[PDB]
Each structure stands twice: as structure tokens, then as C-alpha cells.
Design a protein around this nucleic acid. Structure first.
Ligand SMILES: [Mg+2]
Ligand SMILES: [Mg+2]
Ligand SMILES: [Mg+2]
Lengths: 71, 52, 113
RNA sequence: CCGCCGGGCAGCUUCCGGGAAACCAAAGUCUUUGGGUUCCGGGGGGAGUAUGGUUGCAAAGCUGAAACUUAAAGGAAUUGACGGAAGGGCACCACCAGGAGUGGAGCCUGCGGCUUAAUUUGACUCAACACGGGAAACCUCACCCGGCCCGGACACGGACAGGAUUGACAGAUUGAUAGCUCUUUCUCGAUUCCGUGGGUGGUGGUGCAUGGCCGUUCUUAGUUGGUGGAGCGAUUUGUCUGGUUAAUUCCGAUAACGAACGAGACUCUGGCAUGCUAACUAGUUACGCGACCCCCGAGCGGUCGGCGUCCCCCAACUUCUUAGAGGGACAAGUGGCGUUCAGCCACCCGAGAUUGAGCAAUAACAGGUCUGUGAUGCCCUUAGAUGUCCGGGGCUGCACGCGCGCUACACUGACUGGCUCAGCGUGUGCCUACCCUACGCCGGCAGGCGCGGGUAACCCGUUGAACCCCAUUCGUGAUGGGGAUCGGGGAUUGCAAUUAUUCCCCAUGAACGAGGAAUUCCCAGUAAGUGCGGGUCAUAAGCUUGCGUUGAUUAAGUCCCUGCCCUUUGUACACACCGCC
């Protein structure tokens, strides 16, 4: 038939990052939780919904996985 | 032929469907007697009420 | 194949058939395909007649090797007595009912009733 | 002439008896082994060679090895099968006698090739080539340039929580508002993820691993058994000289008699049925004509010819329409011809014995088909997946080659008025989003925009067609035929037409003035033309399959070519002459 050469750029299958994720939660002295950064406008993602700094991206993850913006 | 080849022979699949119809004037007995009797094989029966 | 299809063919005749046949096409203890055909009695092989008289039946069979075809094709002797066997005659076949009586030339005579 | 007899040349016939068999009064008398005696063979070639001897004037004659190689060579008969053998018979995929073409041009699309990343691909004489229903933008589609997606069943293992990552609204990007991925993180929450085995598909592979289905040898006449009879027995007759027949179909001769499958009979179909049963989902018919009715027309007026309607109907009926039961047509009569049988031929009455398909045996064939099949053997492949797709692309590409089509070449015709005759279908409202269309306006037209009937014999729809038919131009000019190739617009289908989608409107305006070598098609409502349906369809056909319509010429026989059947025969062929050598 042919036998596939492939231009030597074997594309990455990627991990979605490891991440413990939930350590960064400011417990100021007694039990109370609220940090500030950027926010999403969705309903299931109600006010707590939380954002970022990447090489750009930022995303919100709380209408289960329904609804990540474009920034 | 399934698939291509051989000298081109086709079949000529036919089904007929003759319609008879019979007008009448009766009550709701003579209709419900005459229709329910004389059924059985592959026969479809319609029953129009009146005129249209 | 052998002992089985006889067991069938034996049966279907003994049951009460005008005739019958069985075909077991397909590979049969060899890399090559054979085709086997054990036949018995009478069988018409053309006409409209065929359509309401023979009882054709194809069935595959999927085996630990590959695939054979069965074809059973029985001939119905409802020609003798369906009850009113459809048409009954194979159209070739005419049954002339015989003189039965036709006795006596004799001298004339008469009678009264 | 008629006999006999010896010894000669010969013949037929036979269960002597022989004989592998063919055959043989003798090849008889042979495992029941020997009457006398002469010669001579021991697988085939090498080889009747080498060498030796001898004879010969010599050709040569006579005598006459081996190494080596070799598995059969051979003989008799059997079926085959092929003869540039023979009789018989037959097919318009054969010819004759023709027409139509075809093969020439342009165009269409079928293949070949080249080219091309890609022009996936099956199909290779016939029985591959508008064929795979194969008219493809996207799907199709598999294939390439990419690129996404996972739909990894299942189990077996691994993962309780500082939540296994189920599933993520603005940007980097990317094609994509693909969290498919590079931080952020906010939820479903026992799913998840990672191994292992194992699948699961695959329009992957293999049709010489198969089922079915198909194609065909081949709508050709053939094939088979029971009993007899023949052969030790494979086998053979029955199963055939001849006449016949579309047809081992029949009769008869007849060691065969009577049977079975194919043919035939059958089914569907197609035509005669003022014969029947009927029919507002036919027609209706003609009425009765009761009318409207306008001079629609005739006619002063009575009266009439006539479309339309006013119908309805409680007319009447089946004249055509429809579809049920029926009948008939059956070489049935007569005259030839004929073995005076089987039939054939002519004529009568009348459809003269044949209107046309489907069904189609034994037995075949690496025919074709794995890409019609959730039929599938095995093989591959199996996540980066040949799993399924999105986007695009290709399947359409072009110096050449062939294959089926259409349109022409014109004036028995071209375009310009007009008249006017169907049939088989088909249609909505359908398995997942979708028709058939009547009648209003608008627009030239494509079309557009209005509105109406339609499980239909009602609505489309007296299906209002083309040829055809009739009314004017034209004048034999590559012209007004022809009508390709491009310029430009405008509609429509489609989310999208670039790769002119399809259509219209303009505009350009080609070769072809009858086709070189070949070769298929067929006999009666036949060829041809001619539209029209159906199928293919969102869009849509130059494709087929049906349907009428207009409708010819000519064969009505022969085997002259090609190819088929039987019989006899020959055959070193049995991968069957496309052989063997
Ligand atoms: Mg001897
Ligand atoms: Mg001896
Ligand atoms: Mg020897």
C-alpha cells in the first residue's frame, strides 16, 4: 500500500495535568473560606466559580463540564 | 444479480390489489354482523358512515 | 453429513411425501467446496405448479469450521388428497373414471312404477 | 442340371473351445501344463549405435556390446472431447434478402492508458465497457492532505479522600464555541483513569477458505432410472435407419416392455366475446331529455346540429370503462400432399393449428459476488487505530486508446401560425422530515409570489403529446441544419455548487454535407422515429424498464460463414485442439 513515514512530529497525547488542586484555600485563623481572582457568569457555577493565569487560559468548571468561556 | 455481473437479467416483481366495494343501507346491527363474519384471510375491510 | 441427511430424507418420505431432495453444499472435510445431493421419489422442476406444491427451504449452518447450505425441497402429495388438494392434478395428470356399469344389450322389455 | 468323393483357393454362423482384448474352425485340444521339431522375446532408450569380425567395387549386408539414463513405454478394448470425416437436423447472440444502423463528427458517459499525492474500486473474449442499480459537491466513501472523535464491549487486574478527574462559560490557538491539548480552576461524583488478557469493528485482506444469490455451457434439446435383454465386468440397450416435430415430440420399425425429470401441459399475459353479474371511487349511455342557455350555431319561425353546462336524480343502462364469473380456438371442417400412420401443406367458417414472457432438468464452471446480506472461514488491523467521522479533496482530473448512448448532417426537410389524438404508471401527508399538485395575481423566463383537491378509478386528470397532423418562412448556403466551445447576466435546490450542481435569460457561435478497416437485429403490430411515464431524485438525468403512438422495407429458406443438437466414424486428445507433439 504505502507504509506510513509520518513527518517526524509525533503529536503529544496529553495528561490534563496531575494537580492536587485544592490546597489553595485561605483559612484565616478560624473556619472561613473566600479568596479573590477572576470570575465566570454561569448559574450552576454560582458565584464561587473561579479563574486564573496561564499562557492565557482561565477556565470555569461547574455546570459539571458544560461552559468554559474564550480568554 | 447481486453485485455486478453477468448478462443483464432482471425480475419483474408484481403485487396486485383488487378493490371491490358494496353500498348498503342498515342500522348498527347489520353492519356489525356482516363485517365481523366473513373475515379471516389477508382481507382489509373499510366501513364508511355515510355519503362522504 | 451422510447419516444425518438420510435420517432426514428417510423421515420426510416415510412421513408421507410424493418425493424430496436435500442438498448440502459447502466445504466438507477438505479445503475445497463440494456439493452433495441425496434425492428420493418424485419432483417437478418447472411450471407454475412448482409454486404451490414444492416446499422449498434454505437454511445455512454455521460450524466450528465454516458455512454449509442446507436446501430441503419436499414435494407435497396433497395431489392425492389435500382434502381438496389445491387443483390436485398436476395439470399433466388426468383421471378417467371407468365404465363402472354399462351392462346388458338384451331383448327390449319394459317396466312400470 | 442334380448329387457324392479327394485334395485347392476362399465365404458366412455359433455360448465347441479358445481368446487381455480386438478376434480365431481355427489363435480350438494349455495349471485337465509335455505329438515332433526348427527359429526367437524377456521394461523403454541408448541402438540396430560403438567396437570387433566378415561379404561387397559401394549403398551397404550380415554378426553385434556397454556406461548412461529412464519410470513407465506399450497393447487391447471405455466413456469423453475434437476432426481442415461423414450423414441427418437446427439458431437471425448465423447467413441470405434489408433496413435500421453501428464502426466516421461533435457531444455523453463506460472503460483503457498516461498524468496525477488522488484521479479508491470491483468487473478482462466472449456470457468485463450507462455493469456493481456505479446520474456520485457535502453523505455517499472505502481512497489522499489533513485533521478531529472515541463508540477500548467484556472480564481480569489497578484506582476509600488532603475527592478516582465524570463532566468545564472569556483566549493561545485550531478549521472548530475540537477542555483535543499548555495555568485556573469551579462540579457528576464511585463514574473515573493505568496494566492484562480480550475484543469490536473495519466499503481491511483473501470469491482458488465458504453459504446464499446470481451469470452462463443454455428457452439448446436434453437427462434419468424399474424390470427385461446384451455383455465375467466398466458398461450397454431401452435412449432409433427413416418420416415427422418449435421441441428421445411421436409413430414405427423394434431384445424390449411399461415408467420418471426436462420439453410439452401450467401461470401470468396479449388480443373474438350488443352472450352474464354488476358498478355516483368508471363510464356513463343515450336518453326523458325536464332544463340554463346564449344565435354557441342552422333556420322567418316551427324545428334542428352542436359543445358547454343545471343539474341533480327517487332515468336507465351497461353501447365503450372497469373487473368478476364465462365461453371460445380446439389442425376444429373440406381439398391436396404424406409409409396415405405421425403429420405437413392449401382453403371454409373465423383469433387458423404458432400474440409475448415466467417458470426452466441432469450436470457443470477457481464465471461474478466477501463492497446486497447481523451469511461468513480463516487471515490481517485494532487506539496514532483500516474502529466512526469533520473539512476539504479526489472518485469528473488529460499528449492518446477502446465501450455502450444521443444529435446531426437536412427540404419526404428547417424554423414561422395553428388542430388535436394515451398508457403504463406515478404521486402528500412516507422509520425521523419530508409530495402530488389543480386555480388566482406578479414576472419575459427560470420562475416568482397567491391561494384550492388529493390512502386517490374522486384531486392532479376529457392525463388536452411528439412525432404526427394541419397553417405561413426558406431556398439547397456547413444555411435557419447543426448546433459544440466560451463572454456575460438572472432564477432554483441545497448550511454550501469553487470542481460551468440544476434551470432560465441573454451573448460567442464549432466538426459533421452520410462516415475508412470491420460488425448486431430481426419477420408483424416487427424494425425505425416519437414522446411519455416508471426506476434512479433535496437537487436533478444523454441511463436503463415499460408504455403507447406513428408505423415501414424484406427473409418465410438454408446451412454458404459463426455457433448448437443428434447419429455413424476416426482419434497418440481425457487441463479434451486455446490439445497432444
Ligand atoms: Mg499363440
Ligand atoms: Mg505348456
Ligand atoms: Mg530390454
Amino acid at each position: 500500500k504505502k507504509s506510513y513515514t509520518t513527518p517526524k512530529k509525533n503529536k503529544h497525547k496529553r495528561k490534563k495535568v496531575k494537580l492536587a488542586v485544592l490546597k489553595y484555600y485561605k483559612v484565616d485563623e478560624n473556619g472561613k473560606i473566600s479568596r479573590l481572582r477572576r470570575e465566570c457568569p454561569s448559574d450552576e457555577c454560582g458565584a464561587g466559580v473561579f479563574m486564573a493565569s496561564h499562557f492565557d487560559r482561565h477556565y470555569c468548571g461547574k455546570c459539571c463540564l458544560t461552559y468554559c468561556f474564550n480568554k | 444479480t447481486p453485485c455486478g455481473e453477468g448478462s443483464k437479467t432482471w425480475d419483474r416483481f408484481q403485487m396486485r390489489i383488487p378493490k371491490r366495494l358494496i353500498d348498503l343501507h342498515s342500522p348498527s346491527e347489520i353492519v356489525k354482523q356482516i363485517t365481523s363474519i366473513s373475515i379471516e384471510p389477508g382481507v382489509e375491510v373499510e366501513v364508511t358512515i355515510a355519503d362522504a | 453429513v451422510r447419516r444425518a441427511c438420510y435420517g432426514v430424507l428417510r423421515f420426510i418420505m416415510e412421513s408421507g411425501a410424493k418425493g424430496c431432495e436435500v442438498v448440502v453444499s459447502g466445504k466438507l472435510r477438505g479445503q475445497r467446496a463440494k456439493s452433495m445431493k441425496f434425492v428420493d421419489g418424485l419432483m417437478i422442476h418447472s411450471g407454475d405448479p412448482v409454486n404451490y406444491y414444492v416446499d422449498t427451504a434454505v437454511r445455512h449452518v454455521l460450524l466450528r469450521q465454516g458455512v454449509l447450505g442446507i436446501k430441503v425441497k419436499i414435494m407435497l402429495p396433497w395431489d392425492p388428497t389435500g382434502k381438496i388438494g389445491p387443483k390436485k392434478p398436476l395439470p399433466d395428470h388426468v383421471s378417467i373414471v371407468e365404465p363402472k356399469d354399462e351392462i346388458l344389450p338384451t331383448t327390449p322389455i319394459s317396466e312400470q312404477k
